[PDB]
Design a protein around this ligand. Sequence first.
Ligand SMILES: *[C@@H]1O[C@H](CO)[C@@H](O[C@@H]2O[C@H](CO)[C@@H](O[C@@H]3O[C@H](CO)[C@@H](O)[C@H](O)[C@@H]3O)[C@H](O)[C@H]2NC(C)=O)[C@H](O)[C@H]1NC(C)=O
Ligand SMILES: *[C@@H]1O[C@H](CO)[C@@H](O[C@@H]2O[C@H](CO)[C@@H](O)[C@H](O)[C@H]2NC(C)=O)[C@H](O)[C@H]1NC(C)=O
Ligand SMILES: *[C@@H]1O[C@H](CO)[C@@H](O)[C@H](O)[C@H]1NC(C)=O
Lengths: 201, 593
Amino acid sequence: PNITNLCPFHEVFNATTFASVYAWNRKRISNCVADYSVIYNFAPFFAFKCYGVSPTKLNDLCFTNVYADSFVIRGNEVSQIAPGQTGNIADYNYKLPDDFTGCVIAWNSNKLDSKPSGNYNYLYRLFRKSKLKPFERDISTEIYQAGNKPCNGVAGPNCYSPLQSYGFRPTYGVGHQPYRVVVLSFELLHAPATVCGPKKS
Amino acid sequence: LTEENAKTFLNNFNQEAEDLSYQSSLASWNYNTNITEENAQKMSEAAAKWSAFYEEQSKTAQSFSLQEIQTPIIKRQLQALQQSGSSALSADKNKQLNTILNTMSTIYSTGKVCNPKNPQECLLLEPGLDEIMATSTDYNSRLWAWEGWRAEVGKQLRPLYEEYVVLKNEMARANNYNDYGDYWRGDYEAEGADGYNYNRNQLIEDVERTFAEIKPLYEHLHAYVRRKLMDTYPSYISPTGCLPAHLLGDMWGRFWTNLYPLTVPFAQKPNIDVTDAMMNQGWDAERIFQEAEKFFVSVGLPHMTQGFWANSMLTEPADGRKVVCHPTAWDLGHGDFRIKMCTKVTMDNFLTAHHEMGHIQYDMAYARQPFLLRNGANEGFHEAVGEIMSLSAATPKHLKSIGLLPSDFQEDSETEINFLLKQALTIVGTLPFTYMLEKWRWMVFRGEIPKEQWMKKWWEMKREIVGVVEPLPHDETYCDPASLFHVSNDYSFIRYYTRTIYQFQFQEALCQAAKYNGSLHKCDISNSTEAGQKLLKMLSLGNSEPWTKALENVVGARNMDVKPLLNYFQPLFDWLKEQNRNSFVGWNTEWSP
Ligand SMILES: *[C@@H]1O[C@H](CO)[C@@H](O[C@@H]2O[C@H](CO)[C@@H](O[C@@H]3O[C@H](CO)[C@@H](O)[C@H](O)[C@@H]3O)[C@H](O)[C@H]2NC(C)=O)[C@H](O)[C@H]1NC(C)=O
Ligand SMILES: *[C@@H]1O[C@H](CO)[C@@H](O[C@@H]2O[C@H](CO)[C@@H](O)[C@H](O)[C@H]2NC(C)=O)[C@H](O)[C@H]1NC(C)=O
Ligand SMILES: *[C@@H]1O[C@H](CO)[C@@H](O)[C@H](O)[C@H]1NC(C)=O
């Protein structure tokens, strides 16, 4: 049958504004045809690591739901978006489970997310009481109480605001430049799988 | 617990620090490479914000007590952060000390000595008097320039130094130091595991021990220089006496490198200058830095970043903006590594490019360390790791490998002898001067030298250690050390001595690593990945570990050793012994003409 109702991948890998890694954006993708070839030809990618499926077979596989998680991190932290990893991003911002089936895609975004005065609109969580569970988000801005005395809401001695700023600048080194990351998580349930690829004749 | 609070404090600190330090370094770069008033005021506010933030964090960091911190990396970071420095005094004393420092800086930079009977020929030190010290052969003109700058600087800087010593002593005793000399010797203090412990009081005796065996080589070099200068100056230099202070090629006698035309061993043999070969093959600054990068990747160290090539200035811009001519390696932060060098296509700038890229490689290697540990192991390590690259780059093997020197080049012993003598005049001749100056400053700050017997002590030690006599008697109204740039502007001077020792220690360690079987001065470390890894183990550390551990990581020793330095200058030492048989090696303390 005719190929129509393609999945909106052109709205995930090409948004005018991405999200901070602490409040990472999640888009559910269902009831459409998955043309991953647009993903392939969308930029040169610093990493297209796929955990649990092979990069080619994707189009011929049919999954029930596809989650596209989009955020901006610094280049040095791209290695942390993988199962079994530790760091500030993996423990307090974005965690992938150890049985993660999907792909992580990252590319450099100096031309879009770097400013010379400093881009202070990308934030990350540096301090959290406990590590994050997989696919969890914390948007709380509660003052991190690192000592014994109560903070009382006001920032002060041994009381640090948990969200720090990624002060991106165009002259930074390759490991510190902003990188846009889209994580595709494929899940199968008992429900009929409604996200499959294109067919030809 | 205090240690967990310190860990979270340092985590909170590094993110804000890195950003403000990058803003300060970027503003300093934008001023240094586009000198104007607006870039100066932008640099001023950036440094003001960074300094205010650093003092604000240092006051909170001093609340932590180090007796209950066990992990040595956190303890070293908190040690680095808790150094208040000059902020420990009150506002009045700090303002008075800053006033004294500023007036010393602006009276040294505007120093003026003028020709007697010729009042229009008034000379500054930086453009014209250094030319007289470097090139002129006339005894009376050098006596004039030396005595005149001594008078019109020492007479004006003696009381300034008198209260400068007292204010620096107050600042040091406010920072739990015995004197200002111990405050400077605290840069070599290493607190760590057993056997790697270094103390401030140990440094003096280590310097004296390493000067106990450089003294024969220096004595033979001094005798040879004295005989050649006696050939130059017929009756004004004595065979058994010390050298006059104004005949040493510099204003203060710091470097003897300007005595090479007068003291050349073999005048008929030319030098190993390859400037004309660079001119003939159409080399430019880009090719100079690319050859330096090729050297650093052949030895195993990483390539230069794309931001290094994009952001650095390697040429005079010539588009209307003023720049500083001095080559400087900049670690701006966040993976930004730049070099500011107005590179002309010469051999000296080629070696300088190797030196500054050695600085950048050292900076790049410890970027994985925390923010407060992104420094050198001590003040001597950073310049030694560039001087070793300058040493290996200048060898005839390296020059024949890269096409600068012809393939059929013959290395006779005479060019090795005169090259080693030029290296000795630059390197060996600065060591008694450096040791004597730092010993004088240490004993002045300690109070071992009485206040009214300053000058009489200094000219004794220059007769004893350096073997250099005063040309005219000086009383205590002079301040003869203060004519030097490093002492009138509050700079430590022992870093050059430690740099000189560490340089040859590193070179012998890397040449043993590279399995070189010849004389040490001919050694090249090109194409020796294992030597690069041996080096990079120390380079990756920064000041995270004690400097004795980093020194053991390279050379296998935990202290300064001058056996590599004497092994480097061994052919020259044998040659100088062979041509000092008839003459008298050594000097007599009493003033001999
Ligand atoms: C470090 O390693 C490099 C690479 O192994 C060495 O460069 C090589 O140097 C030799 C001799 O200079 C070159 O051989 C000759 O090259 C010319 C020009 O192409 C050619 O006409 C000759 O017939 C002969 O092949 C060789 O090409 C060159 N290789 C490269 C990749 O540059 C370098 O000399 C080594 N340095 C040291 C100090 O050992
Ligand atoms: C050198 O510095 C001057 C000012 O310090 C720069 O001139 C500024 O350029 C920007 C961008 O074009 C303008 O917005 C400013 O108004 C200019 N200021 C002045 C006073 O002219 C100049 O561009 C710098 N040159 C380089 C090569 O960076
Ligand atoms: C992708 O981004 C570029 C950059 O502005 C834009 O020109 C292009 O139209 C975008 N394409 C889609 C399909 O969104």
